[PDB]
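notes to self, project folder thing:

trying the whole complex as one job this time. last attempt i did each chain seperately and stitching them together was a nightmare. two parts in total, labels are on each line so i dont mix them up again. if this works i'll redo the older ones the same way
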Amino acid sequence: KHRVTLRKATLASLMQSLSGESSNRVMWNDRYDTLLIARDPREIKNAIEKSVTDFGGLENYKELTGGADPFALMTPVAGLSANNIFKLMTEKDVPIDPTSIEYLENTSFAEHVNTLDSHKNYVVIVNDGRLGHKFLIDLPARTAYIIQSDLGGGALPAVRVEDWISRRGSDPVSLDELNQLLSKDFSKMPDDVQTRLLASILQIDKDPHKVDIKKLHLDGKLRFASHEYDFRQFQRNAQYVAGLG
Amino acid sequence: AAMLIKVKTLTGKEIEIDIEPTDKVERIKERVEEKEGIPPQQQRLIYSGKQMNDEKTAADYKILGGSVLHLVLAL
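result (full assembly):
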């Protein structure tokens, strides 16, 4: 239980580095068929600069995007944080493309995690169609943590990943509660049970009152897939991103 | 009548989607999701400077072959 402090330090160090232009663009880039650590801060900026030329300069490109400056330091919506942190955690020498992974559609999450080598770290990538949400469950070698951010347009309020990591990143989640939330039956549980699991697991202040279950899609699919990872690899990927200066 | 549209992100990353004028916006988001791994509710899908109505169609926004929709993945 001094690996928990390593893990916290790595995330902390990672999130703080994102104030750097180069780190920011390398973390959240959306080329997925290539290694995270193969990302080149300056190719990326050239491709940004090309698309701002293509669209009549920055002021015009901004109107087209409804205000979004592509050069700015960003923080990602849920899918983009999910995809990229997934890559950072799981990559060594083979690209992993979170965009083409095979999901479980008819497995129960509890039935899935019982299947896992307790001697390995896993990360689970949850595509939750009830919440319209995508997020990570880190299962280090059982103990669970959530990695996520959120646009804010569904049952859960907006959250920046930097802030999520800061408050929640190193705060273990109840597996039982995870079993319940990632149930097919979750859709059918009582209001107050749904809002409490969502609060407990997914809301930065563990506050039920900031959950709105009217925006749940009761017929949403819940998809997940796991992938083992070497902690040292994760640390290393995060050292490259963080070291970009 | 089939048409190829471009969806371009803030990174300049481009994808081509072959659509029809009758296809709904929600549908276009789902197929972006096939490609990019973003849940439709997590997408800010933008054409002519504004976000698009999920129940409205591509024809509703006068989208044509070659039209570029902007996918912004930032808060």
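what i see at first glance: The two ends of chain A are 30 Å apart (CA to CA).
need to look closer tmrw
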